[PDB]
Design a protein around this ligand. Structure first.
Ligand SMILES: Nc1ncnc2c1ncn2[C@@H]1O[C@H](COP(=O)(O)O)[C@@H](O)[C@H]1O
Ligand SMILES: [Mg+2]
Lengths: 379, 375
């Protein structure tokens, strides 16, 4: 009668997310000076280490080492006690120029590849339930840390949500398990930590009606969590792509987002697909919607597009594809104009998810086409 | 009536794949001496650069630089002209290296996915299966000198047309293939050679119609390649590594991780289950979702979607799964005999859908028992 689904998120202090944030901080720094820059910035962090590598073509004059250090500092890795310290880490710059062999609305894609977008009616921002609330658990951890309301919190943290679904209706019934692990100063006991995490992080974020007497709260299940981040651990750009998107509720095409300028369809087409699927759901034309597109390097129009409403569509998926092609320009330059992407808006996207946050920067979360799609379908 | 679906693959010379292959070659070298080793080996490649980083707990004594250079050499990066050269690149080792129950419970809440279907001989979705084959063919003709101007780095992408109610492939709509090459060959000669000698020998002839589009090196030149043209990282091809987007993915990368990482071992077991169900004829399309709870060894929940193709009920398939497979985290290691240097081959051309003897999770060795048990 019921089935389980689990998703997870990680804080801005997780080593993979540190690498993502450094990559997009560098992207933003470049885009502030040179909106047309070509950027493919990869980051590896490890013990005392931040390697910057990849291909950049720009007129911007950016101090990459200072930007990387400032990013790590603002995440919270700025004191000796934490092992990893922006003041005492080596930053090495190994950037190349962009390959000339790789290098107006009909300009070609930067690469081949496939991309998925998704939306559903499970949450206020039209996200699947488990990833939406997993991200908000980590954001809440970060919020309390940075303003000092829980001053013993440290940067690295992880959340997991196991949710019980009704097999027939498909709706969320209850939350089965919450897992919350957080780094912390060594002087706080696990018991004090657990009580504060439940009162201040878990209960203020999750819907009260879905926390029952059967809900399991697993706080720091492996014990104390004093050292974290890149101290004795490695982080890499693009190693949290499922956390970054829909948490396993939808397929993924494989491309990472962070460190890539908006001419990389890996990022821009994934954002467009979210925008398309979200406006279809906000238009009331489906309660679940999934889209796949693909490109060929050096071709403008997508080599394929498909839409699935999983039986919830009020019109055929054929008709929806026609609506989409009339209302959205999915050529790479069309997407950039559609979403106003040539702006230093990406640093915030690189932790706590690229989708489901209706921030002014995140144009692909706007539902400004829903009404137009609703009327155009005859509804 | 019909819909499109697209997947892609890359050759062993793609820089993300170079990093995966170095990571798992190092894993294999460690496991050969120390089957119980803990390994989390991350690789970054760029111009003249191979960075080795991560955590290793082993008694093995491995020359990591030599293993990395030999792997890069075997891939074909043998000249500074390519910006990446096994003999001349810098290899830097940053590993934090330390020296050092079937009912052990899980350490994380887990959701893992596995998938199989009857679309291809090894029971894989069509698009990913043939994209891998396109890339292996490129590698093969480069290595045996039939097309000596080929260089290691290449990608392929297939857009396939499916029937909306049948679920069967009806034709191939678009084939994309980009390959690195020696500068001297013209694009006209390269394109003809790729179509006639790589694409046509690999794809089913009856699915290549007059409407099939061929896009070969659509940039117009592909001399610069490998890590110089594109920085490569371990774990950046996880969809290439699995089902090409035909099934959801839970998140984690495979290469560089020993089998104690459920990101790798549980993904392998889920594929093993789904493949054997399909090979038992109990379904023509099968997605399994397996849940774990912290501190519980046996899975807490199993879902099996046969998409209306199941010959018995989902409840009955789940009962057969629980009886015929050990899905406990350490039971999987035993069931698939995973503590062996078998991973280097998995790190290019897909972890799933190849019936190499190393790949215990691709054996259909339980299909006859399943079909027998179902009736
Ligand atoms: N001039 C080119 N034409 C076609 N493909 C290329 C060219 N230069 C690089 N590539 C490929 O594009 C890949 C990018 O794949 P990824 O970034 O992993 O999606 C590179 O690793 C190369 O295999
Ligand atoms: Mg990549």
């Amino acid at each position: 009668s019921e089935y389980l689904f689990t998703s997870e998120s990680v804080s801005e202090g997780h080593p993979d997310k540190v690498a993502d944030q450094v990559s997009d901080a560098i992207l933003d720094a470049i885009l502030a000076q040179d909106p047309k820059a070509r950027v493919a910035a990869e980051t590896l962090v490890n013990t005392g280490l931040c390697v910057l590598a990849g291909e950049i073509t720009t007129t911007a004059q950016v101090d990459y080492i200072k930007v990387a250090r400032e990013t790590i500092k603002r995440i919270g890795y700025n004191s000796s006690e934490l092992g990893f310290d922006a003041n005492g880490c080596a930053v090495g710059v190994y950037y190349d120029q962009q390959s000339p062999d790789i290098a107006d609305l009909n300009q070609g894609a930067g690469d081949q590849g496939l991309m998925f977008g998704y939306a559903c009616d499970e949450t206020p921002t039209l996200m699947p339930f488990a990833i939406y609330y997993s991200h908000r658990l980590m954001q809440r951890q970060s919020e309390l840390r940075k303003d000092g309301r829980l001053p013993w919190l440290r940067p690295d943290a992880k959340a997991q949500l196991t949710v019980v679904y009704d097999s027939e209706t498909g709706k969320v019934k209850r939350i089965d398990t919450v897992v919350l692990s957080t780094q912390h100063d060594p002087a706080i006991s696990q018991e004090e930590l657990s009580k504060a995490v439940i009162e201040q992080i878990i209960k203020p974020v999750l819907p009260p009606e879905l926390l029952t007497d059967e809900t399991k709260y697993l706080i720091n299940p492996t014990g104390r969590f004093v050292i974290g981040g890149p101290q004795g651990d490695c982080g890499l750009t693009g190693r949290k792509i499922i956390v970054d998107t829909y948490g396993g509720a939808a397929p993924h095409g494989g491309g990472a987002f962070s460190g890539k300028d908006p001419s990389k369809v890996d990022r821009s087409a994934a954002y467009a697909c979210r925008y398309v699927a979200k406006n279809i759901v906000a238009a009331g034309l489906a309660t679940q919607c999934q889209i796949q597109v693909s490109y060929a390097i050096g071709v403008a129009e997508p080599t394929s597009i498909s839409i699935d409403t999983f039986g919830t569509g009020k019109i055929s998926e054929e008709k929806l594809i026609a609506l989409v092609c009339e209302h959205f320009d999915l050529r790479p330059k069309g997407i950039v104009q559609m979403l106003d992407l040539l702006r230093p808006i990406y640093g915030k996207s690189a932790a706590y998810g690229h989708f489901g946050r209706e921030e002014p920067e995140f144009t692909w979360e706007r539902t400004d086409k829903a009404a137009s799609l609703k009327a155009a379908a005859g509804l």
